[PDB]
Design a protein around this nucleic acid. Structure first.
Ligand SMILES: [Mg+2]
Ligand SMILES: [Mg+2]
Length: 673
DNA sequence: TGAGGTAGTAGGTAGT
């Protein structure tokens, strides 16, 4: 809807840049030996770092704000095994105009460097990047959570500085990998060099003797680090096998004593609370923004106000107009089919719980379809017969199994599902001390169960620019060269697609198959596809996919999503509403997807239209709606669009169960929710 | 396993 509201950003306008800042000093750079085309840019950057002061790369040369003789006009740096001799020559001043995209960038680069150079000269504070930490929030054996704020400072076309401030924490590991393991914690997924910044993937530990491991040189693992003086101050422990994130499938030996665990919120199981109420955070933010302008000398800050547009509330329906997915059990659903469900009471009496058996019929009646509820009489004990039962039952048309068991132990949960999966039957689990009085649990269970059986419970109705929206998920990696999985939404259809090595191949392969399955279920290829991916993924991993789409005349729109750190939104006067769309920049925009995002403060999505020609408003609209299109959880909507939310589960479970691939589970069957 | 939000994590052809 055009012109509805205004909101406060996580931003603050500050004093304008003085004339001297608008005309930084330009420094000429001389490298010896002369570099190679693609090696100039890095080297330059590196030099701007060595020279010190507030200086950055500008073209083939440099630009600084600090005077020529504060800077290190001469020096040397060794990049990639080759040592160079740099030499700077002050070649006067040169003005820049923030109203030019080109020069504007140099000005914002300059700003960021200033923000951290001024910042770095502050007592009582740890500065990691463009972030500041001033207090200990929580601390335990081997770890500590720091409290601060992540900042950013750039220049506005208006010509003034602009500070972005969002208070946040930092999980720190204060001990080596060896020490940490020695405490009984599980192996960390990520680990970094005790001696520098480099991080790797922790694969295994090894019984291998550090003194036996021979390296490509004929030198010894232990000796190698010993020869680098890394064993002077640290005790190397055992042999840790690590992997370089750029090639996770090539093992690299290493020592646990020289590695530090990269702790994630998960590694600290059980209790610190890192959230913050929207009104508290908004306060801490203002007190940090003011703190900076004072000590930094950027002027008093003024909270930025931006235009916001409320998108229309999604009209989602089953057979009838519904409000939450769960209302489809009473009113009936969108697309019904003949489906046979099986029961697996694997600890109890036997027999379908009165109300479920009632609710089931209750829904198909309101839908008008044939329902056949069978029973599975077997057990993990009687394996051979258990499979005999599964093989028989599925052959009878059973398409989904509702496993009614007491709180299972993880390991056996995957085991059970896995066995069920292999011989063709998805499975929904509902713990067994069941009370009919709790219709939030079994309704959700029935909701998933039906999804797993391949029944569309709800769909949308609108004039969306995309006929198909497919989101991609590469696990928690930043490249599709490891795994990757996909989920599309479309007659509404919900299909999943798994890997059948170059990343661009993986992507065009998740995409093609999605197009093929879609062509089978809809008899047609889509006119336009909406591509949704996680922002922290090179956009080049989609180059091949885009050429293919164009090559077959299929319209598209690539949109990167930023789950965390996209900024925050505060109401000027009133409340925040769902689907609040905040245009924000060239091609980017913020989208608030869930209003009651909790005990802390809502985290809006940050989207970037990287390819295609569709109004940002058009996209926002569809993307916000895809949000209410998620089958499970018929009482709460996902922050992310069904496509991205489903791909995340599709990946998580593909690893939970470690499934290589499924012959058939008809792709309409959402086994992973 | 009923499900979701807030929160933080990957720094934002050598090396071992
Ligand atoms: Mg189906
Ligand atoms: Mg489920």
């Amino acid at each position: 809807h055009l012109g509805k509201t205004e909101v406060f950003l996580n931003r603050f306008a500050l004093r304008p840049l003085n004339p001297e800042e608008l005309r930084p000093w330009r420094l000429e750079v001389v490298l010896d030996p002369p570099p190679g085309r693609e090696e100039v840019y890095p080297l330059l950057a590196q030099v701007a770092r060595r020279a010190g002061g507030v200086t950055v790369r500008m073209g083939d040369g440099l630009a600084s704000w600090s005077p020529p003789e504060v800077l290190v006009l001469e020096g040397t740096l060794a990049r990639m095994g080759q040592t160079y001799a740099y030499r700077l020559y002050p070649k006067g001043r040169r003005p820049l105009d923030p109203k030019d995209p080109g020069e504007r960038s140099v000005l914002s680069a300059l700003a960021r460097r200033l923000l951290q150079e001024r910042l770095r000269r502050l007592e009582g504070v740890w500065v990691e990047g463009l972030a500041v930490y001033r207090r200990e929030h929580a601390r335990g054996p081997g770890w500590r959570v720091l409290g601060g704020a992540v900042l950013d400072l750039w220049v506005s076309d208006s010509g003034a500085f602009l500070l972005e401030v969002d208070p946040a924490y930092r999980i720190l590991c204060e001990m080596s990998l060896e020490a940490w393991l020695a405490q009984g914690h599980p192996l960390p997924k990520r680990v970094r060099n005790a001696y520098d910044r480099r991080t790797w993937e922790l694969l295994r530990l090894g019984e291998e003797d550090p003194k036996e491991l021979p390296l490509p040189g004929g030198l010894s693992l232990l000796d190698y680090h010993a020869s680098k003086g890394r064993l002077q101050g640290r005790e190397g422990g055992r042999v840790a096998w690590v992997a370089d994130p750029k090639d996770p499938r090539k093992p690299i030996p290493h020592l646990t004593g020289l590695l530090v665990p990269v702790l994630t919120l998960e590694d600290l199981h059980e209790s610190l609370a890192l959230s913050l109420p929207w009104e508290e955070r908004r306060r801490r933010t203002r007190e940090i923004a003011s703190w900076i302008g004072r000590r930094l000398g950027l002027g008093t800050p003024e909270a930025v106000r931006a235009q916001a547009y409320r998108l229309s509330i999604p009209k989602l329906m089953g057979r009838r107009a519904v409000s939450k997915p769960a209302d489809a059990l009473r009113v009936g659903f969108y697309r019904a089919q003949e489906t046979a469900l099986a029961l697996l009471r694997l600890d109890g009496a036997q027999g379908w719980p009165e109300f479920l058996r009632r609710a089931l019929l209750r829904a198909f009646g309101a839908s008008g379809a044939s329902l056949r509820l069978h029973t599975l009489h077997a057990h993990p004990s009687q394996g051979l017969a258990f499979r005999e039962a599964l093989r028989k039952a599925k052959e009878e048309g059973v398409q989904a199994v509702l496993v009614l068991t007491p709180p299972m132990a993880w390991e056996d949960r995957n085991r059970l599902k896995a066995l069920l999966l292999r011989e063709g039957l998805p499975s929904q689990i509902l713990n067994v001390p069941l009370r009919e009085e709790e219709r939030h649990r079994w309704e959700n269970a029935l909701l998933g169960l039906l999804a797993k059986a391949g029944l569309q419970v709800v769909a949308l109705s609108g004039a969306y620019p995309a006929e198909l929206a497919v989101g991609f998920d590469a696990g928690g990696r930043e490249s599709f060269r490891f795994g990757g999985a996909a989920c599309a939404v479309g007659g509404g259809h919900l299909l999943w697609t798994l890997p059948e090595r170059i990343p661009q191949e993986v992507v065009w392969d998740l995409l093609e198959e999605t197009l093929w399955a879609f062509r089978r279920k809809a008899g047609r290829l889509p006119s336009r596809v909406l591509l949704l991916r996680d922002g922290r993924v090179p956009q080049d991993e989609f180059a091949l996919a885009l050429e293919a789409l164009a090559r077959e005349g299929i319209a598209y729109d690539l949109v990167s999503v930023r789950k965390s750190g996209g900024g925050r939104v505060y109401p000027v006067q009133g409340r925040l509403a769902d689907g609040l769309y905040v245009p924000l920049e060239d091609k980017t925009f913020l989208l608030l997807t869930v209003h009651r995002d909790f005990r802390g403060t809502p985290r809006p999505l940050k989207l970037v239209h990287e390819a295609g020609d569709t109004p940002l408003e058009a996209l926002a609209h569809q993307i916000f709606h895809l949000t209410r299109l998620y089958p499970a959880s018929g009482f709460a909507f996902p922050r992310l669009p069904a496509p991205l939310h489903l791909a995340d589960r599709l990946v998580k479970e593909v690893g939970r169960l470690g499934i290589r691939h499924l012959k058939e589970v008809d792709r309409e069957k959402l086994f992973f929710v």
